[PDB]
Amino acid sequence: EIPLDIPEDLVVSLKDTNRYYYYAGETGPAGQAGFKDNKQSTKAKIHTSSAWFLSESSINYNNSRIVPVGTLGSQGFGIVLPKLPDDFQQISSNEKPIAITDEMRGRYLTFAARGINSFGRVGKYQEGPQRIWVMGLPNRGMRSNLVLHTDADLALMRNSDNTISAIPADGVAHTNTVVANYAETKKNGVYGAVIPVINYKEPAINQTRQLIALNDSKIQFSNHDFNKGYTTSMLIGNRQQTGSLLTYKLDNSLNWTVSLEANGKIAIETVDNTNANNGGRQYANVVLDYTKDNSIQVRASVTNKILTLEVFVNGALVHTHELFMERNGVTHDIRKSQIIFGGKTFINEFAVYNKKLTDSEINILAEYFSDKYRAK
């Protein structure tokens, strides 16, 4: 297939980037390609052609159609990845940066190049060592308010020799993990906390995916001003779960917790040690089915000294909560709220916005979560 005179030293890479995920609305990096020994390739009269490729909406593997799943890794049993070129479409004819569109979310982009001899006989397109994943999370003007975002599928593991590789699909938690706030695209967003991640092959989809498994430990994010309005949107996996999935420590005296019970009930627990609110337990008007994935979103906003929290399960409102911020002589200053994930939970993805998402935005995220591993 390949002409005998194409040299073996073609070098293909992404220029000036160490980040291999991008959101819709961003522009990706330029590609770069060339023969290492240019004296040799000129003497053979070889030139190059290059192109960007976008992976298809599904992968054709083992005579079936598999849903694409993200990874930031560079095999045997494990993740199913698109093959170049059968699972890609060529989208450009050069190395110039690609403007990432909404229609590219949840796909791979890869840059490839080939040698061509002076008779016009082409070699095979060759990619560099690293593909780009286009984040599945819808943007549509939301990205200026995305403050935290972690997709468990993008977690990696750090080996003894400090190299970083994919987590093996062995169904057990690993704690030597590389997990980040991916919304942070300028500075280091890798979390310093211990975040156990499980990679496993999910039979429902004949494909791997990953789950954060905190096993009742907590991860804490501080200094969130809930007066701006705030929204936490989570996707949890299809296993039985219990405990404090999400806790808002609005104050040293005021906290509000989404607590899962094993029977699928969602308890809403309020603690206020001031006289501003009583506190106690309420139950959301829902029962989770832990044999499916479920999305849980909480949006909060302050209007006229009242903090309203609304809970959306799989897109549906199932609980509204009002908390007095100024009552009976107390004033709760919630400019430095804490957002805590925890419980014996299995978290596939979470996103935090420093605004109250509209009804439309809540539905957009609920549909993304519901279709993340579904046929597209």
Describe the 3D structure.
- It is a single chain.
- This protein has 376 residues and is mainly beta.
- It has two domains: 125 residues, no CATH class; 229 residues, Sandwich (Jelly Rolls), CATH 2.60.120.
- It is 5% helix and 43% strand.
- The protein is built from two helices and 30 strands.
- The strands form eight sheets. Strands 2, 4, 7, 8, 9 and 10 form a six-stranded mixed β-sheet that branches. It has a six-stranded antiparallel β-sheet with strand order 11-30-19-24-25-26, covered by helices on one side.
- Strand 12 and strand 13 form a beta hairpin.
- The two termini are 33 Å apart.
Topology:
Elements: E1 10-14, E2 21-22, E3 31-35, H1 38-43, E4 46-55, E5 59-61, E6 64-66, E7 88-90, E8 108-117, E9 126-127, E10 132-134, E11 146-151, E12 156-158, E13 164-165, E14 173-174, E15 177-178, E16 197-202, E17 207-212, E18 219-224, E19 230-236, E20 243-249, E21 254-260, E22 265-272, E23 279-287, E24 294-303, E25 306-313, E26 316-324, E27 326-327, E28 330-331, E29 337-341, E30 347-353, H2 359-371
Parallel strand pairs: 2-10
Antiparallel strand pairs: 1-3, 4-7, 4-8, 5-6, 8-9, 8-10, 11-30, 12-13, 12-15, 14-16, 16-17, 18-29, 19-24, 19-30, 20-21, 20-29, 21-22, 22-23, 24-25, 25-26, 27-28
PDB class: structural protein
Keywords: pilin, structural protein
Assembly: monomeric
> What structural category arises from helix and sheet content?
mainly beta
Please give the radius of gyration in angstroms. 24 Å
CATH class of the largest domain: Mainly Beta
Number of strand elements: 30
Number of domains: 2
Number of helices: 2
- Helical content class: under 10%
Q: Span between N and C termini?
A: 33 Å
Spatial shape: elongated
Give the percentage of residues in beta strands. 35-45%
What's the CATH topology name of the largest domain?
A: Jelly Rolls
Main sheet characteristics: 6 strands, mixed
CATH architecture of the largest domain: Sandwich
